[PDB]
Amino acid sequence: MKLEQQIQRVILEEAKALIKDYHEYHNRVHLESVRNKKRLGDSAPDKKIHRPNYWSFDKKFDPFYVKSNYKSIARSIANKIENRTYLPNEPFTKDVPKPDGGIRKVSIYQIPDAAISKLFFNRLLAKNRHRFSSFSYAYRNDRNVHFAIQDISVDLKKNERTFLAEFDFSDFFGSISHSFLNEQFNENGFYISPEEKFIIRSFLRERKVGIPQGTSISLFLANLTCWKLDQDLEREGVKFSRYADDTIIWSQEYSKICNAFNIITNFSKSAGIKINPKKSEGISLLTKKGLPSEITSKNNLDFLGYTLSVENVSIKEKSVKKIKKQISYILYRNLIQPLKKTSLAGQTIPANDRDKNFLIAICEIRRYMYGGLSKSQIKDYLSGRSNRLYFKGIMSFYPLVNDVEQLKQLDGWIVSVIYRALKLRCQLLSKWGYNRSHNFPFILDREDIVDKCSKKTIAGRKLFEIPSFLLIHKALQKGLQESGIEKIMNPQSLNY
Amino acid sequence: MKLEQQIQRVILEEAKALIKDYHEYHNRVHLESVRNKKRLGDSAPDKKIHRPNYWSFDKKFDPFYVKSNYKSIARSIANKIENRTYLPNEPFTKDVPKPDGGIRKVSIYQIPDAAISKLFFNRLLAKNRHRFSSFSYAYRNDRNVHFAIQDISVDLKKNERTFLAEFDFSDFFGSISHSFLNEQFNENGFYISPEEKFIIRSFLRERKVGIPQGTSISLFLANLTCWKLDQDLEREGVKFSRYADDTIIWSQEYSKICNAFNIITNFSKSAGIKINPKKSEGISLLTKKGLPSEITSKNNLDFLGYTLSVENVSIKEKSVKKIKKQISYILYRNLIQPLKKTSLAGQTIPANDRDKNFLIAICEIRRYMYGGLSKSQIKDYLSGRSNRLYFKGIMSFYPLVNDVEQLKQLDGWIVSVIYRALKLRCQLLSKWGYNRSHNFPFILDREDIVDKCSKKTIAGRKLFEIPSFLLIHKALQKGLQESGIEKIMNPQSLNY
RNA sequence: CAUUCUCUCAUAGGGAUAACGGUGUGGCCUUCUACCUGUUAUAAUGGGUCUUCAGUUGUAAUUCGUUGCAACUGACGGGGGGGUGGUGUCAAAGCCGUUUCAACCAAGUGGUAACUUACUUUUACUUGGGUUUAUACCGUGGAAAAGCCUGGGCUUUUUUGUU
RNA sequence: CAUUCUCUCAUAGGGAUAACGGUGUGGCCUUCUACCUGUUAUAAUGGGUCUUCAGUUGUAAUUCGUUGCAACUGACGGGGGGGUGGUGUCAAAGCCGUUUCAACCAAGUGGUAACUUACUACUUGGGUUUAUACCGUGGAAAAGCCUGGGCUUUUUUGUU
DNA sequence: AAAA
DNA sequence: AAAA
Ligand SMILES: Nc1ncnc2c1ncn2[C@H]1C[C@H](O)[C@@H](COP(=O)(O)OP(=O)(O)OP(=O)(O)O)O1
Ligand SMILES: Nc1ncnc2c1ncn2[C@H]1C[C@H](O)[C@@H](COP(=O)(O)OP(=O)(O)OP(=O)(O)O)O1
Ligand SMILES: [Mg+2]
């Protein structure tokens, strides 16, 4: 019957997706193990395949078991739903690390219950997304974080003095009152069928306050919870952009922003979600770099991996530190770490001006940021010689960055760190009894690294060119002007 | 070539759609001719197949010719586009009747140019719809008039006294300055590639002011033109809803609505689209039925076939008159009009309490409003006995009507008109020499028509039941609750 | 000037091809209808019944938000013109009847009929999806007849292929 | 406790099952290119070159928005510590060099190392099959334990 | 998920 | 197209 077929399809698709993910995981683990043995030699550890721990907690957690008998599970689920007796099995909750705020309580529901929640979340979103505020970029399938950043950037660039108000909700998911939620079902012209309402209440039955964490239906519940707040902020005339609990409000008038503060306070008192004074920065005044300000002032704001100023959009400083950590660790892992072991048995010592480890490190760096694109391909796309270019790297997560200066500094940092890591590798090789300072990768000065590396050619391709952020940024700008926000983050589903 | 394949696909799809429409048209004409001959007897006119006149104006207008050689057309179009020399051919402009405002000039572009406009409109909308205001419901794949009506109804029901202003632009499409349009291309973070910009300018080259009327790129340009107006209205805090030129702005404060008037005036002065004094009602005050008012007051407002009051949503009076005209003409055509001819040769005369013409008229009426649904099916859906119901009738164009009293009056009108038309048919039959007043369809009183017609059964089905608006309205409400607005009018596209 | 296939100097021009595309009805599969009752060895099949909403009562749960069940009550087919009765008041209005006229707009017009391949125009749609017997459509093929020009061509009917 | 197929009392329980699912590389088709130069009867293949942005100049169209073309100019790889020189000043700051240290965080810490299956969102344009090879389960061999057949560990084969 |  |  209709519901049972839908549940069958959803459960089968979810189980097959999980199985494909596991197979990719173990295949790439084997491949990386082969590469690691080619890297550390005799000191390389053995391949270790981890099945997820909770698969042993219950059979329905296992994708393989669910795929084994999914028709029976779907039949039983449909029968229980039609009898109004269905209740999701309790999830496996683990302490996901949140050192910024202590610890966070995540939950992994069983595959059938997670599939049911996903299906009903899809239905509810489909029939109700026209009622959600257009500034609700939280989750959804029509709104992205990048749309919010574009909106904020354009509006900030329009004027010169803006009043900000950044607020976070302390444990937003875990402190939603159930009375408020049940009162919200008959408001704003929401269309929730009795089956969907019963399912929603079923997912809230175990707890007495707040919505479960880590399941799809909670996303729709969170979006629906902040509808009166969104309407009030809109009718105040302030501009805002909410993403889950993270909210940023900016207006040109102090009175409007004070009223927005009062509105959020009233909404919190109505729904029981208090604001943590720590993460909430309060009311500020976003000016230009050197404009005098009469109240508390800041020259830039941070919003979901972007540091937004009046003039330009730039990568968040913490995200820049993450990028630096990843690149530096790639260099250390492929250049220095193998040489710090007790023995170098089974390792290929660079010779004849052929350091394969340097080539591997450069290729992996290019994969990290470009995604494997050569400079020739990017330049061809920029010139218009070609029309196809795929964007999947660290930059595809920040398509709207227009801060060329920050990317210039990042490129300089990359070159300098490459030079210093090469110097350390040469020193370690000398300490190990190999003089290689006159060979190709080590004899290069910092100034001449980029030029000589670009000139270098292997197998008819330039695999040694040092990747640059500015080039991929130019490609990103052209791709935005020809494809659109959707295409840039098309593969990269902003799940953060 | 990527562009040429896209153009080929679009042109082929458009031509095939037009060919399918034509074949449906002539098959339907033949079937209706057979039925008409079975109705009018020897006085029935002969079948007349009309190919559209403009197909002879140029071969590219003909879907058959385009489908003949579409690869060549697409190749030439792509070559001309990439040479920046492409220019759409002159459309066929005809005087579509607009007696409300005199006449209107619509344009039918050639199939290749129309296909190119549709393709580039799809692209531009896809990469820019996230910048359009959520309150613009015209020419979108995510918005439609019913979302606007739902929003207006909910907001009106929230309060009791609302200040609203209604404005129509005198000639929205034909009086848009091209300087303003070309200035709008670099605003609001719009992503328009140089190719799309060139195409847009190509479609505007023939005229010196205003956008064409009959293409899709004109629809996108109309949406893009009113972006500053939408942003200004949103920043004022007024809640508005725009559908093409028809704009409705309602707020709880007089000052906000006066500022909205000033904003629209400034936008008109900036874009050259002067408002229409006759069509624009100006600033009013929407109260309840008997609440005293201090300024010009109205109890209900009209917006795209809906008459919206504070309490309930009802069909527009002109649309109700259209429904009455259609139903009454169905009755007159199947009952009275054949009997007004000079001779009754070849016409079946009712006998043995079997009026096939009455059955045909009732079935056609049911097709008009229900779409062919029996009362049993609708009652089964309402009870929950069944889960599948299809909504395609006159009611599917007004899914949000919650005025049960108006539908009750319409049902009474239907029954009374059926009774009176049957009486006239009996009188005409008597005048023609046939006494049938004692037979089934005519002996019925007005009170007993519905009951006995429901009891009547032919071929194991109740094809004689008089259709009722209230039942299909209940089905519409349940369908809105279960499936949502998009699915209810999914087949019944109410766009324009 | 095949609406089919193909070629190219490719939004145009050649070639050969007689099918190309589409409709109503029916069969098969696939869901999708509670109950009652016809006919057969228990399944087809035929004839019927009900489904909704609101309130109250009682009842069973509820994680107390809410929900199910049972019984009653109520709602569930317009308006206008004319005649007339009862009720209502001091007299009315009003309310409740009953009779008569009508295709609708028209509860209207200075006036009142027509129309659906219509009308205007924000304005307008037809059966749940595939699978093939018979019916049959647009245009193009051919076979016949006719009526014109020329001495083969044009036009009109019929037939056949698509079928 | 096949992750395969099938049955049902169907979010659980049976049956037989030897394949099931997936990865890297290659081939093939189909696109995503300009230019110069190697080799062959004119096409493959090998090796190189450039592509961007802004301004100015002049030119050609423009439906006056703008666009094209040509030539120049300019931009196009961070920061910190130490030494040192020149410039700058009344003296400085500052600016311009040059030299040296460092894997990154670190322009930092009370202190400086480690780490990627980590910590707290991604890996090559899409299908099509030679060889490589993975998870889990069957098999066949060996071994090491219990029992007198079972358990555990390795090797081989089917997927392949 | 609209032009024409 | 949307989370564990
Ligand atoms: N990566 C994540 N994926 C999904 N949900 C997340 C993630 N991180 C946090 N959440 C949850 C926790 C919150 O309910 C909400 C995001 O809020 P967050 O900014 O983490 O602060 P918080 O609500 O935990 O506040 P506090 O730390 O003060 O309790 O979604
Ligand atoms: N049926 C239609 N199809 C396409 N465009 C239309 C249609 N009707 C109107 N338009 C155009 C005209 C306007 O620019 C806009 C809609 O305007 P509309 O509300 O019909 O009034 P209008 O602006 O034409 O007033 P007027 O009749 O006085 O000229 O789209
Ligand atoms: Mg928070």
Ligand SMILES: [Mg+2]
């Ligand atoms: Mg108008």
Ligand SMILES: [Mg+2]
């Ligand atoms: Mg009348």
Ligand SMILES: [Mg+2]
């Ligand atoms: Mg350091």
